[PDB]
Structure formats: structure tokens, C-alpha cells
Design a protein around this nucleic acid. Structure first.
Ligand SMILES: [Ca+2]
Length: 579
DNA sequence: GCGATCAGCG
DNA sequence: ACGCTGATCGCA
């Protein structure tokens, strides 16, 4: 029902200087995954190509790699990386329908061309799931069915670029797509393909020492409970704690007794078993997620892990990291942080370099709220978290422990993002009236933040959405809901999203500027990871000193705010040492 | 499959 | 009853 040439060879008219291109990779993880077909729509017609013929044709390969041949695509990073795993470079991507749909409305959850097309009443294309099936039924359909699906996706991309660009323009988002998200997409593709090298000998050695310690703690838990049970099981654990041992019930879930860490540490006065259960879970978490889980995804011949950075997923414009998640490698407790010793540079005599923003969201907040006192604090390069810990725990800078700081940190963000006196009192183990008086005192010192919180909720009610500094957008229909709890969660999204999303915009601009500066300087250094406000690189040890000056400066200058941006940086032999 | 839990980011 | 995530596990 849609006309196309199922081509047997590449022709010159398939190589126009403007085209919609589909390079189809059906596997969710596209690393080293099969490319199952190719479609090209341009002014000359619609074309399907088998990949074993198109990807071995030197004129088609050249066309893919020529940046003056412009391509419109959907999820160009997936295609670019799958092509890198074929040894082929994709350049010239000038429109990405996925990133355009994400910028227009991240809540759509647009995961395929059909979902994006539906935003503009375009429906001459099927959802990927209807073509490929789900789960155990997932299959590449017969070639005629595949070819038409890929042609229809390309035809849709060809027709939808113009209306998506016009809405982006109206939203002040067209430069955000073309100068930020699309260049970032090529950078993420390089980081993912490069991967991170893992010391599997040390990982396996740690896992075996962990397996020993796990058994020891397990037996002492049984001995302390006077019986054995599935410590990982909520029912049995609840029975032991709150029926056999008759500990107080401080919280319930919809399922039954809550056993979360906040509850367990409140039960530490009552029974020593609860601290062994915490230690057990922590060791089990390291074993299952960060030892076994990492060894499961290491590519054995290179010892590399290749994460996927999802760029069109979070509602605030942050990235996320999948399979493995390299954005939540342990750091806070010493036992877990040692896992970062397994993350090593990918060449001999290279080093890991890490740089990160300090208190980025509070600085963003100070800029956006124009709060005089918060701006003055950052002009003094004050460490708000430490000073806040001094106030909470009535101690001096010398006496503020890491645990007191990271808890002061949760209070600092908690307050600006709508924590209640109840919530604060539970977190600080203080009374509820002390928590309420603390909160009003902090708003006395920072009335411009309080103003910003009120103004931004009212702006979300009037406009229907909130925006970030670089014009990222988030619709909040629940903000006018009659339901109190629904409306409350939406109000706290209105307070939080412009701040967190602006901090995401800044690190993204920093990554783009860093790549251009690294090229300008002809350095071999390259990005490996982003962790929200941190960039991890590797480089020859001979570049470390230049990077100590280049990277912080690129990050500090990514944008110009009413307060300065502060970057810390470290390097070393492993990711562990780059702190 | 989902909710609870916990690892990270602020 | 601060916000944004992803992986693992048991299943009340
Ligand atoms: Ca930081």
C-alpha cells in the first residue's frame, strides 16, 4: 500500500544530499546488534536496501560518512553506534525525530516513529511492536513486511521534520535540538562505543571475598533470629522482626510491614539483628548488582562494558544509563566504593580523569531565584552543605562528618523542593515543631527562594508547563487538579524541574564545548561517562596536566550565571583513585 | 509484571 | 508528606 523500490544494488539517486534514513536495529541493546534493513526516502523515491549489500557498497558507505549529505532519522544514536560496530561512520544527521518529540513533550514516552507521528495526526506507519511482536514472540517479519515498515518509518520522518521544527521554533526549542541535543547525541554515541575497561580479575576476587562475608553475616542473622529464613523475603523478614521478635511497627506498605533502611535504623535500639540485616543487604546489593551484574555485561574479548545513555527518557532532561547503569556505582560507603577499582583506563599509561560541578542545582537556583543571600553565599564559594550541617548538629566545620554533610545535603534540596515538617522531622529525628521552625527560619534567610517557589507554581498553573534555562519544557496538567495529593506532587515538580533540568542543560553544553576544545587542542583524551553533574574521561598520563586546566575551565564557562560555577577534579589509575 | 528496596545524582 | 533515575528480587 506504499510504493517503494526493493533495491538489489545501490544507485546514485539513493545518494541525494538530503534524505530520511532508517537503519533498523531491533534489539533493545543496540551494542554489537544486527542491522536488519535499511530504508531511504528522498526527492527521487523510496528505497529499501538489504544491509549486507548496502553496507558493503563503497558509495553508500561514503554517503553515510559524508557530513554534507544530510540525514533525517529517528534515534540516530542507535543507528550510529550499531554502524560503529560494523566499522562504519554515520555523519550528517541534521534532524532526529526522537529528540524533537522528546523536547516537545517528554511525557509522551515516544519510543518509536509511530508514537512521534501520532503527535501530528500522522498514522500511515505502524508501531514497532505490532510489526516485531513482544517477548518470546519477538521476530523480524518476512522481508516484504519489514521493507514496507522501514519505508513507512522513513516516509514519516520525511514528512514530519517540517511540522516538528515549526513547533520547536514556536517553543524557543529549535536551537536546543540543533545546537545541543543533536550534537550531544553524536558525543554519547562515541562514549558508548568506546566503553569502559573493567579489571575482571579484581572484580571476581572481590566477589569471592564478598561471598565469604555474606555467609558469615547470614549465619549471625539466623543465630540472632533463632531460626533460618529468606532474609531477602519481605514476608518472612516482617514475621521475624514484628511478630517473633515483636519489634514496633513504624511504617506499613500496601503489601505489609515496611522493612526499608530508614525503618531498620530506627529499630537499632531494640535489637542488634536489624544492623546485621542492613549489612547483609548492602553486601548482597554489591554481589548481585555490581559484581555479578557487571561481569554479566562485560564483553569478554576487550573486557569492556558499553552502557547505553538514554537521552529521551527523563522528564527533566537528565540522561539515564542502562545495562549496565554506570551512573549509580557505589561511592558513599568504603566497602562499596572499592568496586570503582575495577574500572580502569582502556590503554596502558592512560589515566582516569573526573571533573564535577559543586552544588550545581543550588547555584542554578540562586541564579534563577535571584535570592540575594543565596547568591552572596556562592560568590563567597561557601559550602552550603557543611555550613548547614554545622547548624543542624550544632558543631564546627572540623566536626562535620561525611554523614552529617550528605544528610545536610538532603535537607538543603528537600527544603527548596517542598519537604514538609513531617518529612524533615523524620529525616533529622527531631520533633515536628522543631522541623517546622527550622524550615521557616531557612526561608527567612532566603526569601527569594520562597518567592521563586510560589511564583513558579503560579506560572505552571497559568501556562500549563515549566521551562528550563535553555527552554526545555515539561507539561504539568495535574497542577490544577482538584485532588489535593495529585496537585501537591505536581507543585513540587514545578519547583524541582526547572532547577534540575537547567543543571542538565548546563552539563550537556559543557560536554559539547569540551569535545570541541579537546579537538582544537588535538588531545587524545575522550569522554567515557557522564554522571549528571560529573564528566569522566580517560587520557594518556602525558595529558593530565593540560586537562587539569582545560576541563574545569570548559565546564565553568559552559554558561554564564549570576554566580560562578565551581568544578572539582581528580585523576588516577582507576575510577576509585579519580577522587 | 510490579512494588519494595537501594545504588547514584541533585 | 523533597525530585530524577535503574537493577535486583520476591511475590503479603
Ligand atoms: Ca558534585
Amino acid at each position: 500500500k506504499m510504493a517503494f523500490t526493493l533495491a538489489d544494488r545501490v544507485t546514485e539517486e539513493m545518494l541525494a544530499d538530503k534524505a530520511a534514513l532508517v537503519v533498523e536495529v531491533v534489539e533493545e541493546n543496540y551494542h554489537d546488534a544486527p542491522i536488519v534493513g535499511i530504508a531511504v526516502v528522498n526527492e527521487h523515491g523510496r528505497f529499501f536496501l538489504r544491509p549486507e549489500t548496502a553496507l558493503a557498497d563503497p558509495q553508500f558507505v561514503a554517503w553515510l560518512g559524508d557530513e554534507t549529505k544530510k540525514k533525517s532519522m529517528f534515534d540516530s544514536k542507535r543507528a550510529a553506534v550499531a554502524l560503529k560496530w560494523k566499522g562504519i561512520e554515520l555523519c550528517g544527521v541534521s534532524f532526529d525525530l526522537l529528540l524533537a518529540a522528546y523536547l516537545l513533550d517528554p511525557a509522551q514516552g515516544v519510543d518509536d516513529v509511530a508514537a512521534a507521528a501520532k503527535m501530528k495526526q500522522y498514522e500511515a506507519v505502524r508501531p514497532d511492536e505490532a510489526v516485531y511482536g513482544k517477548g518470546a514472540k519477538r521476530a523480524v517479519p518476512d522481508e516484504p513486511v519489514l521493507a514496507e515498515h522501514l519505508v513507512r518509518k522513513a516516509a514519516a520522518i520525511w514528512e514530519l521534520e517540517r511540522p516538528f521544527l515549526d513547533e520547536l521554533r514556536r517553543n524557543e526549542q529549535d536551537r536546543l535540538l540543533v545546537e545541543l541535543e543533536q550534537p550531544l547525541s553524536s558525543i554519547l554515541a562515541e562514549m558508548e562505543f568506546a566503553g569502559v575497561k573493567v579489571d575482571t580479575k579484581r572484580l571476581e576476587q572481590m566477589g569471592k571475598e564478598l561471598a565469604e562475608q555474606l555467609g558469615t553475616v547470614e549465619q549471625r542473622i539466623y543465630e540472632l533470629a533463632g531460626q533460618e529464613f529468606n532474609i531477602n523475603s519481605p514476608k518472612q523478614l516482617g514475621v521475624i522482626l514484628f511478630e517473633k521478635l515483636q519489634l514496633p511497627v513504624l511504617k506499613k506498605t500496601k503489601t505489609g510491614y515496611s522493612t526499608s533502611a530508614d525503618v531498620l535504623e530506627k529499630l537499632a535500639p531494640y535489637h542488634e539483628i536489624v544492623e546485621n540485616i542492613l549489612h547483609y543487604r548492602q553486601l548482597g546489593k554489591l554481589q548481585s548488582t555490581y559484581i555479578e551484574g557487571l561481569l554479566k555485561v562485560v564483553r569478554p574479548a576487550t573486557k569492556k562494558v558499553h552502557t547505553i545513555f538514554n537521552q529521551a527518557l527523563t522528564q527533566t532532561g537528565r540522561l539515564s544509563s542502562t545495562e549496565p547503569n554506570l551512573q549509580n556505582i557505589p561511592i558513599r560507603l568504603e566497602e562499596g566504593r572499592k568496586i570503582r577499582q575495577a574500572f580502569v583506563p582502556s590503554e596502558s599509561d592512560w589515566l582516569i580523569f573526573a571533573a564535577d560541578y559543586s552544588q550545581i542545582e543550588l547555584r542554578v537556583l540562586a541564579h534563577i531565584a535571584e535570592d540575594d543571600n543565596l547568591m552572596e553565599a556562592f560568590r563567597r564559594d561557601l559550602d552550603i552543605h557543611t555550613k548547614t550541617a554545622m547548624d543542624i548538629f550544632q558543631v564546627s566545620e572540623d566536626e562535620v562528618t561525611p554523614n552529617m554533610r550528605r544528610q545536610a545535603k538532603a535537607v538543603n534540596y528537600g527544603i527548596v523542593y517542598g519537604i514538609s515538617d513531617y518529612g524533615l522531622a523524620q529525616n533529622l529525628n527531631i520533633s515536628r515543631k522543631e522541623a517546622a521552625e527550622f524550615i521557616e527560619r531557612y526561608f527567612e534567610s532566603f526569601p527569594g527562594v520562597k518567592r521563586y517557589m510560589e511564583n513558579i507554581v503560579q506560572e505552571a498553573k497559568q501556562k500549563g508547563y515549566v521551562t528550563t534555562l535553555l527552554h526545555r519544557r515539561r507539561y504539568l496538567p495535574d497542577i490544577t487538579s482538584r485532588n489535593f495529593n495529585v496537585r501537591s506532587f505536581a507543585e513540587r515538580m514545578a519547583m524541582n524541574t526547572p532547577i534540575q533540568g537547567s543543571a542538565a542543560d548546563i552539563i550537556k553544553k559543557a560536554m559539547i564545548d569540551l569535545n570541541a576544545r579537546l579537538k582544537e587542542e588535538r588531545l587524545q583524551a575522550h569522554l567515557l561517562l557522564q554522571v549528571h553533574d560529573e564528566l569522566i574521561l580517560e587520557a594518556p598520563k602525558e595529558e593530565m596536566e593540560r586537562l587539569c586546566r582545560l576541563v574545569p575551565e570548559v565546564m565553568e564557562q559552559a554558561v554564564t550565571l549570576r554566580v560562578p560555577l565551581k568544578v572539582d577534579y581528580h585523576y588516577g589509575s582507576t575510577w576509585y583513585d579519580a577522587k
